[PDB]
Design a protein around this ligand. Structure first.
Ligand SMILES: Fc1ccc(-c2c3c(nc(N4CCCCC4)c2-c2nnn[nH]2)CCOC3)cc1
Length: 133
């Protein structure tokens, strides 16, 4: 029942500062502009200990499956090859990606009827709000 309140299909409804987050991460111009238009779906499911998070969009479909606390390989939407670890901390899913000596942290939180996602790279934070689809 670890992630019960996260399970579902979630659609992006708002984004703030995501272009600047992407710049800080190192995403190139064309990817930033195209990615910035999209309203992706985030589809979260759980089977035993395995959590699956799918992202479906006009740009890219991708998917991660993982066990909390257990590092895995991830290809990001902007084509970074990262080493990811996702944990639960006080009911927040905390996702750390490591690549090329860099690190970014992505938090997913249930707040009211929304899923609030905060992405941080150095001093830049972005907030993306998703609603049930
Ligand atoms: F069409 C799309 C598809 C994917 C993304 C996208 C990107 C990146 N990180 C993301 N997430 C945010 C939610 C939590 C995980 C990190 C997304 C995303 N937004 N919604 N789902 N995934 C990194 C940079 O490249 C794009 C943006 C537009």
């Amino acid at each position: 029942h670890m992630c019960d309140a996260f399970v579902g299909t979630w659609k992006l409804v708002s984004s703030e500062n995501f272009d600047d987050y992407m710049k800080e991460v190192g995403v190139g111009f064309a990817t930033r502009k195209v990615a910035g238009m999209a309203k992706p779906n985030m589809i979260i499911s759980v089977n035993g200990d395995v959590i699956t998070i799918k992202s479906e969009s006009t740009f890219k479909n991708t998917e991660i499956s993982f066990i909390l606390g257990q590092e895995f390989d991830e290809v990001t939407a902007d084509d970074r090859k990262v080493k990811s670890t996702i944990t639960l901390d006080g009911g927040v899913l905390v996702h750390v990606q490591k690549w090329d000596g860099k690190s970014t942290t992505i938090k997913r939180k249930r707040e009211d009827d929304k899923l609030v996602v905060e992405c941080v790279m150095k001093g830049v934070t972005s907030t993306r709000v998703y609603e049930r689809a």
